[PDB]
Subunit: 40 residues, 4 copies
């Protein structure tokens, strides 16, 4: 599952894309059930 590199001009954007990236990656630390109970 590839390690790819995204160049970002602008710290404001970079920090936003970073935010999004992390929160997406950090979701695998939650049980599938929690993520499901959060939706309903």
């Amino acid at each position: 599952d590839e390690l790819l590199y995204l160049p970002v001009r602008g710290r404001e954007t970079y920090e936003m894309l970073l935010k999004i990236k992390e929160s997406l990656e950090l979701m695998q630390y939650l049980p599938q059930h929690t993520i499901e109970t959060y939706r309903q």
Copy 2:
């Protein structure tokens, strides 16, 4: 802390913005320490 409504034209976009929204909200279920240990 306001409840706001974002109208989305397109299911492909909506599902992306949804994805991002959830993963951002679902991060409060993780310890601040986990989020920190994930960064380093």
Copy 3:
């Protein structure tokens, strides 16, 4: 092409998701060629 509604808790998030949504929608105002010349 559906009009869907995304509820957002938090103005900081809403404004981010809004930003992303707009910039994605506003890209249809550019020529496909511009978007392509921007990539290369």
Copy 4:
């Protein structure tokens, strides 16, 4: 205005973050007036 580098694990994510990044950068090719007329 810094050039920063965001490493992404996963092509699906990378392509999403790329999408967002581009559409945000590609908005400077539109007149401020267009972006404003799009909002109202």
